Design a protein around this ligand. Structure first.
Ligand SMILES: O=C(c1c2ccccc2cc2ccccc12)N1CCC(N2CCC[C@@H](C(=O)N3CCOCC3)C2)CC1
Ligand SMILES: O=C(c1c2ccccc2cc2ccccc12)N1CCC(N2CCC[C@@H](C(=O)N3CCOCC3)C2)CC1
Lengths: 696, 696
């Protein structure tokens, strides 16, 4: 016992495994539920400081397999785990779910066989994933591992013999490995006969048992660990489409560990804990030369957070747990439950204060969440303090996060107007390599930002099941050689695929000072998914195939411009060339103005390509009710889908709207949401009555 | 008329549009059905040279919209198209479908408004896509366009007026654009009142109508073209998952044209025809300096074929049409029809001649299709002349193509053992750029090859609906800094997602001299999709978590090695150090051999991670019947799925197998396929009898 004379018992002595986990720079597995309790309690303090919490607000129950391999809840002492994988069922009362919400936490025990994955850990991880999926509840994975387990048939080590070419000269080589009769008998005696595959031959009177294959009695030596890794990789790929999956890299994640991080998509990486495939030491042995000095050069935050493999970084385990808990606050309690509404001091009924100007640089985050000013806080489009930005280390030209609109949680995609830089590191493995700094202008989709946009859309859709708003402001895709060669077309196409798959309301809004041109409009147009998408343009927004300079270059050429000079200039109507030179700069400005006059939201409304033209200051009030009306109609569309089996979305929606009182303006979002919420139980009775269904 | 005195009528004079298309270096739209007829006739000649074909073997009928916008077949003169998009319904008798197969060909008319996409071309393209999809038939798109159509309100051009700050000095600036009463009246007279949005003001006695927005009377000027582009982009994204989609880049594909190429995935690019977003001329104007000299620098084959955006290149239009027709020969006639069997002179019943050796370099294509030798042709795993390689210009470390196994079409993925190089071009837009040459060793998955593998899997699955064979031979993923930073984890994960989605039989086969290690096994293990996947290892294959050098380094260290010296060496059992130095190189070899003895297919069988260990020479005979048995059982599984609605795959398969005569060995593929094919109609009666179904 060390240290002596402490006020309370030495927890690292009662369970020496806690000390081992600590010695490896990570939280001991059994102490993670306590971190979730601390993080959950902080959520309450930040929400309503006056709330009196009691320990019954949070329950953690360890899940273990029974005799028939079925998961069951247990209350046992920490460190009793017979396998290197542990799980907990968490039931927490949160500000968004005051009566309780549930989730599962799976974790590697780094103190158990270095946190390696053997067949038993793989089958348990899979069982826990299926458990989460069956219930529709989130699956949190805490990664702290050495990858797939490795071994050798340790029983064959003291028994094997070598068929030397020349016994007196070992250096001269060997023919094969073999066992003797006494070697064979040793295996027979310990019931390990099938540990080797032998072939008997007689050499100079003595019978040799030529080892043809070594199998081993102990399970979890090789391929069986690789099979199990495959099983859990496929399980995670499926879980991502079904439930909310998130991973916290808590010590290091190797091989299958690294793949699991990616397959669950949403990842929080603790500073200094690497996500690696092959370690730096092993790589130097493969390369010959001592190339790398740390695993952080391969899988640190400097790699993974900059990549977008790590969505967020955390200073320590508790910060990571706090970020999981914060992220989950935007997510339904379970699959297909409504998005969790959480109204704060910042009500829907107010104008938007922060307004962008064409002559001034702005951070898009100011439009999203507002900004502090010497003269007071300028509120933005979304609820004050609700913006939770993710993928913040990668493709900084797009800003992705979760936010709340008068309490309604949603995914937000905004455009960074400021030029962004990123540094490609020099790989020590190549002596003829140097670090490159890449600049990328704002309001242009590059391969990385196109990938980030698609990624964000998919992550809001799967598991999170959130509605979305895109504050669309792109001049197009980068069509230059570098970006075309770097497959910008592929990444842009992922955006289309991501929108086709979206199952919740989408709002595309071209903001004030914003533009949506050529290829950028194509990839985000509401006809991609008419069931979910809707588009709005601000009165101060712009849109067209080309920018005014482009339109003029193709459609308002010199002959058209000179004819305009002939019409509008008294002097024009060699003495022409001198007036041409004088007039040309201002007539170029006239044609640019003529072109820009087509690019207005009024033309967008006239041509029916936008639902409405909006005023930014009034957008919060408009979108709050539009979204709230939309969530309600979508709820009723889903109920109707059960009650028929075969009807189109247009048919379902028209039927639901036929139920509204004749006095109800179908175009009034507030009136429509107010009537539905006043009649959920009445509409339910209407639906239960429609159960006069027998259709072939 | 030019030229005079030709033997037959001058087709470029009868229809001057044919000459226009030719002048732009492309085939005239109406002449494309003839290219499909020529290509189809060549298919027959290559299959059975003696076949007598008559014109009734090929039928092309143009599709146009009727009064109610419904597609109908027409026989009209070429060049009569009122829109810049044309379509044809093709009915061809091919070697794999001698009674006929159908498909639709959509194409831009480059002679109609420069092949630009206006709202009418967009609605027609979408209508044709839906037509193809409803019928399950392939959709071939021939791209020859200038992207979305652009325009201005040409009626406002001679009418507009400028509110000069100082009329005598135009250079001093202007306030706004306006119309006069006579300008307003001109619009009123021609029923174009809504061409502008005006606001009347009186300035110095004269009434000015301030132009606030220009709308225009003509449709297809801007945003409406962008909306239509969005519609067709989403339509193509959906079509790719539903039917066989392919695109031939026949002149140039701009903006939406480029996106359509990618969204349909499978693309054949004719040499010298660019896939661009923004042209070189427009880019130089944006950049200031004359940076690019050709659109080929942005979207030529040197970019797109090297990228994997273009799956194949073609020397001319007919070569492209020939490649479409060849690709389609592996594809079912329509969605959910069986894969087209095509037996050739190369029967299933033969050994595999080409065998790889560890001491010699080989091209994996020799294992796939065989190779010519001075002593005769050495047959490979698949049918002679059946290997159709695609994505051949990109990530050359993986070899992807379609092939036939005793007539059975399937997708093949093989590993290039030879080191591959690729040149990243220097972008002229950046003066501080130089071309980089990247070497990548064989049997290692890099970001590009991981992406290509996933891409291939998805392209075999969607629309092609083919079974697949992966001749798995990877040592792992590249875990170095460069590849980790270039998101190898993301690309590797796409492989898992692609396998989870696979709906046809998969065979994973570790070939002779081949290995499957660590991360490479994980990503391809059959537990990822047990309903479709199966794994086999050759008797001369190897597999383990690490390579023997790695296993020794972690599990057969110096203390274990010295104990072995103590046991096996008479002299060992400072005088120790000298013997240690002598023994160490050979004892390192012993431990490497000990480790390798675990890596055998016998351990894989023993541990139940492979279905069987195989002999390469006998693989063709084995796989032919395994695949044929599998296709049959899968057919019966689908029929049963209709007749119940709710039963697991394990339940369905066990039930189908309960129908086999008691004498039938369920493990005998040939006997199982022979019995099913002898009883399809009997099993059908059994299924029709199971239609005593009323389950709640
Ligand atoms: O409207 C024009 C256009 C001009 C725009 C600005 C100045 C001069 C122009 C000249 C043009 C001449 C003819 C057609 C279009 C023109 N476009 C051409 C450029 C298009 N881009 C959209 C955003 C990405 C841009 C791009 O590809 N880049 C710019 C940044 O990265 C390198 C390459 C180009 C936008 C449409
Ligand atoms: O088995 C070993 C291993 C050794 C292999 C060969 C020589 C020396 C080794 C030393 C090792 C020491 C400790 C663990 C594993 C070792 N592995 C470590 C390397 C693993 N790679 C699989 C294929 C890709 C390889 C890789 O990441 N590269 C190689 C090519 O590109 C750059 C980086 C490494 C394979 C597993």
């Amino acid at each position: 016992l060390r240290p002596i004379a402490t006020p309370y018992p030495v927890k690292e002595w009662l369970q020496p495994k806690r000390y081992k986990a600590h010695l490896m720079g990570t939280t001991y597995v059994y102490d993670f539920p306590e971190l979730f309790r601390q993080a959950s309690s902080s959520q309450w303090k930040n929400f309503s400081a006056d709330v009196k919490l009691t320990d019954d607000f949070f329950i953690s129950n360890e899940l273990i397999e029974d005799e028939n391999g079925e998961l069951t809840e247990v209350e046992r002492e920490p460190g009793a785990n017979a396998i290197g994988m542990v799980a907990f069922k968490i039931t927490v009362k949160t500000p968004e779910y005051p009566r309780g919400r549930q989730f599962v936490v799976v974790a590697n025990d780094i103190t158990f066989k270095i946190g390696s994955f053997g067949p038993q850990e793989d089958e348990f991880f899979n069982k826990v994933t299926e458990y989460a999926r069956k219930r529709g509840i989130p699956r949190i994975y805490l990664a702290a591992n050495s990858g797939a387990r490795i071994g050798m048939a340790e029983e064959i080590v003291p028994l094997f013999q070598v068929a030397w070419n020349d016994a007196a000269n070992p250096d001269k080589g060997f023919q094969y490995l073999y066992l003797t009769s006494e070697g064979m008998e040793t295996l027979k005696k310990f019931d390990k006969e099938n540990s080797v595959l032998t072939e008997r031959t007689v050499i100079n009177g003595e019978e040799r048992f030529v080892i043809k294959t070594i199998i081993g009695s102990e399970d979890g030596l090789g391929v069986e660990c690789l099979r199990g890794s495959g099983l859990i990789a496929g399980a995670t790929s499926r879980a991502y489409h079904d439930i909310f999956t998130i991973t916290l890299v808590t010590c290091r994640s190797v091989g299958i560990g690294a793949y699991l991080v990616r397959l669950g998509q949403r990842a929080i990486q603790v500073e200094g804990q690497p996500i690696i495939l092959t370690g730096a030491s092993a790589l130097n042995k493969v390369l010959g030369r001592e190339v790398y000095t740390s695993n952080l050069q391969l899988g640190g935050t400097q790699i993974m957070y900059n990549n977008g493999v790590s969505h967020l970084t955390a200073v320590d385990d508790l910060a990571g747990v706090e970020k999981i808990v914060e992220w989950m606050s935007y997510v339904p309690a379970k699959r297909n439950m409504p998005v969790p509404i959480l109204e704060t001091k910042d009500t829907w009924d107010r104008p938007v204060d922060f307004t962008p100007t064409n002559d001034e640089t702005y951070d898009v985050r100011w439009m999203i969440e507002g900004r502090e000013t010497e003269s007071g806080f300028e509120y933005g489009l979304f609820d004050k303090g609700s913006f939770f930005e993710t993928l913040s280390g990668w493709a900084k030209g797009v800003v992705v996060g979760r936010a709340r609109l008068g309490g309604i949680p949603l995914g937000v995609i905004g455009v960074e107007t400021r030029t962004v830089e990123n540094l490609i590191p020099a790989d020590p493995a190549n002596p003829n390599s140097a670090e490159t700094l890449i600049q990328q202008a704002g309001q242009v989709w590059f391969p990385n930002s196109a990938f980030k946009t698609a990624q964000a859309i998919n992550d809001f859709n799967n598991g999170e099941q959130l509605p979305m708003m895109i504050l669309a402001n792109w001049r197009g895709f980068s069509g230059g050689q570098r970006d075309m060669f770097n497959e910008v077309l592929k990444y842009g196409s992922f955006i289309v695929d991501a929108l086709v798959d979206y199952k919740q309301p989408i709002i595309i809004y071209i903001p004030p000072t914003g533009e949506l041109r050529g290829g950028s409009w194509v990839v985000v147009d509401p006809t991609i998914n008419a069931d979910q998408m809707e588009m709005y343009a601000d009165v101060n927004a712009r849109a067209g195939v080309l920018e005014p300079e482009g339109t003029v270059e193709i459609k308002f050429r010199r002959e058209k411009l000179l004819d305009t000079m002939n019409r509008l200039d008294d002097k024009y109507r060699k003495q022409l060339a001198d007036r041409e030179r004088e007039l040309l700069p201002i007539y170029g400005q006239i044609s640019l103005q003529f072109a820009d006059l087509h690019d207005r939201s009024s033309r967008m409304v006239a041509k029916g390509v936008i639902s409405k033209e909006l005023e930014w200051t009034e957008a919060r009030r408009f979108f709050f009710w539009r979204l709230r009306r939309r969530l309600n109609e979508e709820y009723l569309i889903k109920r109707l889908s059960h009650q028929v089996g075969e009807a189109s979305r247009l048919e379902k929606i028209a039927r639901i709207r036929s139920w509204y009182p004749a006095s109800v303006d179908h175009e009034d979002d507030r009136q429509v949401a107010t009537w539905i919420e006043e009649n959920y139980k009445t509409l339910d009775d209407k639906l239960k009555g429609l159960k006069l269904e027998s259709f072939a």
